[PDB]
């Protein structure tokens, strides 16, 4: 065995563990989610596991979807000098075209044999795994300050008397047993002798700190396009209440969509409809209020 604990400022190591674990957790959660936002009229007719596509797109490798046996299996694809042949690395096994491939972008609208590359972002300047590191430390220390604020927001009622058995019988039989009408000696024995340590310099501070945590989440959120935007259009709470500057959050949402524009180039080739929409739906009540067809009653209940 080996044991000799520090003190009870162990909490001052537990506090910094909460901050450190919050940064690690929020960082890898936020990129645990971020490669699924778009999902684009999900599997109309096309054999793509779009989850495996979007995970590949957020490590910035240019995937290439084409035909394999007329059914659109993904492949990897790493002034205008045109690409034609299957020179690139190919991830499937035997489903390779073994024939004339092409990029279907500008050779014509809708004619050439399909192997179209899809960028994550049309013009690439900085990776957004750096922006997610940029705010999560700032977010980490505001989560530190919230946790440190509510950890010292606890309150005792200090009794103050010369020690051995004068005031103990008082609080036992007449405060925590709830008793009104306790009788005492005239020796100033509650003339502000019992005192309260309060932290009312802490609870007005508490709510404003939560609002700073909240709008910093929103200021990370609208950067990476994930937004509450369309419902904010129909709710009429459009500007300076949701302090987000709508023209910037509809801006950063759009760059990821027109990065995945070459799926429309593919969609024009084989005669089908694939639009890169932007997912904001969460179900069992939204699907109920949009239909209210009695077959949807036998589906849910």
């Amino acid at each position: 065995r080996g044991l000799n604990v520090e003190l009870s400022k162990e909490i001052s190591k537990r506090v910094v563990e909460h901050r450190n674990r919050f940064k690690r957790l929020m960082f890898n959660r936020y990129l645990e989610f971020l490669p699924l936002l778009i999902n684009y009229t999900n599997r109309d007719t096309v054999g793509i596991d779009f989850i495996q596509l979007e995970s590949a797109l957020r490590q910035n490798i240019n995937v290439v979807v084409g035909e394999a046996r007329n059914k659109q299996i993904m492949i990897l694809g790493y002034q205008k000098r045109l690409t034609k042949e299957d020179i690139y690395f190919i991830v499937p096994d035997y489903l390779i075209p073994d024939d004339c491939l092409q990029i279907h972008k500008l050779y014509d609208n809708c004619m050439s044999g399909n192997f179209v590359v899809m960028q994550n972002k049309p013009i690439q300047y900085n990776s957004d795994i750096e922006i997610i590191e940029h705010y999560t430390d700032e977010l980490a220390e505001v989560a530190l300050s919230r946790f440190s604020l509510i950890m010292q927001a606890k309150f005792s009622k200090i009794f103050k008397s010369e020690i051995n058995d004068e005031s103990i019988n008082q609080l036992v039989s007449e405060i925590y047993n709830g008793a009104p009408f306790v009788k005492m000696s005239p020796m100033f024995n509650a003339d502000d002798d019992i005192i309260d340590l309060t932290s009312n310099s802490v609870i007005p501070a508490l709510t404003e700190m939560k609002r700073e945590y909240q709008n910093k989440i929103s200021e990370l959120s609208n950067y990476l396009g994930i937004n509450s935007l369309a419902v904010d259009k129909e709710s009429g709470v459009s500007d300076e209440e949701a302090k987000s500057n709508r023209g910037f959050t509809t801006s950063n949402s759009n760059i990821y969509l027109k990065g995945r524009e070459p799926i429309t180039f593919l969609s024009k080739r084989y005669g089908l409809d694939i639009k890169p929409y932007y997912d904001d739906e969460t179900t069992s009540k939204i699907s109920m209020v949009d239909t209210l067809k009695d077959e949807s009653s036998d589906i849910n209940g």
Binding site: F27, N28, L31, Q59, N60, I61, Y78, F89, S127, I129, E130, I132, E133
Partner: protein
Amino acid sequence: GMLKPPFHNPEFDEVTHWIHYYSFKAISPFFNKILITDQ
């Protein structure tokens, strides 16, 4: 498998790629060849 799958390091927020390939070259000693220089 000439480009292997990438490696992201989220501790530095970084993306690392490798390229592997197996090359081999030799001269077979069973064909005619000559050499003209000032040795």
